[PDB]
Amino acid sequence: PKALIVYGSTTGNTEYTAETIARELADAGYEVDSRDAASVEAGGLFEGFDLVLLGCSTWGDDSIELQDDFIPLFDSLEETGAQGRKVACFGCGDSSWEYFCGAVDAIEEKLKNLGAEIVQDGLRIDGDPRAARDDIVGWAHDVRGAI
Ligand SMILES: Cc1cc2nc3c(=O)[nH]c(=O)nc-3n(C[C@H](O)[C@H](O)[C@H](O)COP(=O)(O)O)c2cc1C
Structure with a gap:
């Protein structure tokens, strides 16, 4: 199985979190592709993947705003x-x-x-x-066990 992790992170926290998850999935036997949202295009992004994990931090002065690269x-x-x-x-x-x-x-x-x-x-x-x-x-580990 192939898993895609796409993250939007500004200060590195969600990025760390994505890397942590990626190693767990890989150790279990998934082929993992971890990508910064800044580097991807939306169109057909999830094609070919059995599992997709999306990560993003939260921003906004007085509204809920997604991380810029994720928008x-x-x-x-x-x-x-x-x-x-x-x-x-x-x-x-x-x-x-x-x-x-x-x-x-x-x-x-x-x-x-x-x-x-x-x-x-x-x-x-x-x-x-x-x-x-x-x-x-x-x-x-819970995500894996839920597939
Ligand atoms: C102006 C500003 C707005 C924020 N708004 C939220 C918010 O609504 N909810 C939240 O949980 N965190 C909020 N944060 C916290 C960031 O999401 C938090 O620092 C996070 O660790 C950033 O993750 P990242 O390094 O992956 O981008 C806000 C931080 C800043 C400076």
């Missing part, structure tokens, strides 16, 4: 090949904000409309993800 992908999600695709989401944030990891919710909701199959509720990391390593590894 174009979210805006064109309908062209990615999400129907019937097994997906799960993750993100980093900071619980000082009420809309903690709000990006994750926005992405999940769109995916559901698009007919994707959300295999596990999104992983939401507060603060330094290295401090949450066990939680990330545990979530990767």
